[PDB]
Every structure is written in C-alpha cells, then in structure tokens.
C-alpha cells in the first residue's frame, strides 16, 4: 500500500468503487471534489448522486 487511506464508495447497495488517498488530500471522485481528513474520513459523506463514502487507513498502517 502506497497511500495512507482507502475510500469505499457504496452505490445501490454495493461497493463497486474504491479510491486511494493520503491524509488531508483533496481527491476527485467522478466530477466531485472530496476531502480526506487526517483520520482518513472522506467529505462529503453523501455525494450529489447519493452514493456514500467511507474511509479508513490501509492495512499497511497509517
């Protein structure tokens, strides 16, 4: 694992998309800006298409 965080994206009941991010990084998911804070939590939690974001440190540590 090369970046601190994994962001999972739930759409229609399943996770079919994940995204890598470092702490305090702004990334883009589709056309949406997402901020991943120092605890690997993504914001906004609900994207405008109503998919839901969830984040955590990778199993290869912080």
């Amino acid at each position: 694992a090369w970046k601190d965080c994994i962001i999972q994206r739930y759409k229609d009941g399943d996770v079919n998309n994940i995204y890598t991010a470092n702490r305090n990084e702004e990334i883009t998911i589709e056309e949406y800006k997402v901020f991943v804070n120092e605890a690997c939590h993504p914001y906004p939690v609900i994207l405008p298409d109503r998919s839901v974001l969830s984040g955590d440190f990778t199993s290869a540590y912080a």
Binding site: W2, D14, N16, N17, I18, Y19, T20, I27, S59, A60
Partner: protein
C-alpha cells in the same frame, strides 16, 4: 517501468465469486504503487478496472494471481 509517467486504465479478469473476495481483490489492486481507483465491472462482476499513473502491470497481475488464483490481464490503455 514501461508505463512510468503515463495515466493508464488496466483491465484484469480476476476470480472473485462473492462479495468478500471482490472486496479483497479491490483492496489488493489498490495497494499497488500508482493506483488511484479500482472499479468492479462486467455482468458477472469478474473484472477490475484499475486506474492510475506509473502502474507496474506485472506486479499488479502477479499479486492478484497469488491471492485469488486466477487473474489475467485483458488490456492496458491510455486516458
């Protein structure tokens, strides 16, 4: 490597017959240096679409193959 500096989309067919193994395979792909996003596709949910920059496709397939048994590289493409 051969894709250093290039933004690539890489499609791998992986043995992932359930939701647990799909989550595991996506997390594995996501751990490979350069990977920005991973997506599950196909009507049988059997393909990973891996997007990033400077990805080593040899290492990506080798890792998927060791942990899931069967993984085959379908294509590498620019974007």
């Amino acid at each position: 490597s051969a894709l250093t500096g290039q933004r690539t989309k890489i499609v791998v067919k992986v043995h992932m017959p359930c939701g647990k193994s799909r989550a595991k395979a996506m997390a594995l792909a996501a751990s490979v240096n350069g990977v920005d996003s991973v997506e599950i596709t196909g009507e049988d949910k059997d393909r990973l679409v891996v997007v990033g920059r400077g990805i080593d496709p040899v290492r990506l397939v080798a890792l998927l193959r060791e942990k899931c048994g069967l993984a085959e590289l379908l294509m590498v493409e620019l974007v």
